[PDB]
């Protein structure tokens, strides 16, 4: 049910990521660097537990979770959030909540590419990842 998302993915396109980061309050110097970074995202499962790694020259993150079970997360920009990841319409939907705020990170597969849509406030960012062999 998560199976086609699994593997190693490389960023190959990004739209409106600065808008998204700015909406979250990320400072200008961090946004510079992030705008030029091409992370690698690794999605692995072991039974019911998924692990999602994001690696770059700037920041690294790792989360582990079961689908449909809330978990604590500390994001790349140091927000302490309550998170849940589910499958919805075949999309992997990650919802983060903190301070009454929310942001969604939605992943879907289109033509074999992994499209990540990030929404916070009115900002909508679309990042495209391609699978590494």
Ligand X SMILES: CCCCCCCC(=O)O
Q: Report the distance separating Cα 112 and Cα 99, nearest Å.
A: 36
Question: What are the distances in angstroms from CA 40 to CA 47, 49, 102?
Answer: 23, 20, 24
Q: Is 75 in the site for ligand X (CB under 6 A)?
A: yes
Region for residue 55 given its phi and psi (left: phi exceeds 0; alpha: psi -120 to 50; beta: otherwise): beta
115 binds ligand X (CB under 6 A): no
Q: Which residues contact 108 (CB under 8 A, 6 or more apart)?
A: 90, 91, 92, 114, 115, 117
Q: Which stretch binds ligand X (CB under 6 A): 43-51, 70-78, 80-88, 107-115?
A: 70-78
Numbered residues of the known binding site for (9Z)-octadecenoate: 127-129
d(CA 88, CA 111): 19
User: x/- contact string, 7-26, with ligand X (CB under 6 A)?
Assistant: ----x---------x--x--
Q: Which tokens is 96 given?
A: 């983060």
The encoded tokens of residue 94 equal: 């990650």
Residues flagged as binding site: 127-129
Q: Pick the closer one to ligand X by CB: 8 or 54.
A: 54
- Cβ 101 to ligand X shortest distance, Å: 13
Contact letters for ligand X, residues 27-66 (x by CB under 6 A): ------------x-x------------x------------
Asked if residue 102 binds ligand X (CB under 6 A), the reply is no
Q: Which residues bind ligand X (CB under 6 A)?
A: 11, 21, 24, 39, 41, 54, 75-77, 116, 127
């Amino acid at each position: 049910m998560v199976d086609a998302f699994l593997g190693t993915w490389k960023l190959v396109d990004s739209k409106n990521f600065d808008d998204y980061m700015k909406s979250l309050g990320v400072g200008f110097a961090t946004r510079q660097v992030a705008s030029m970074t091409k992370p690698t995202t690794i999605i692995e499962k072991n039974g019911d537990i998924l692990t999602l790694k994001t690696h770059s020259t700037f920041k690294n993150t790792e989360i582990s979770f079961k689908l449909g079970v809330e978990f604590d997360e500390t994001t790349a920009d140091d927000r302490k959030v309550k998170s849940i990841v589910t499958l919805d319409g075949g999309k992997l939907v990650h919802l983060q909540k903190w301070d009454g705020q929310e942001t969604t990170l939605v992943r879907e597969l289109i033509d074999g590419k992994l499209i990540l849509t990030l929404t916070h406030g009115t900002a909508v960012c679309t990042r495209t990842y391609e699978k590494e062999a």
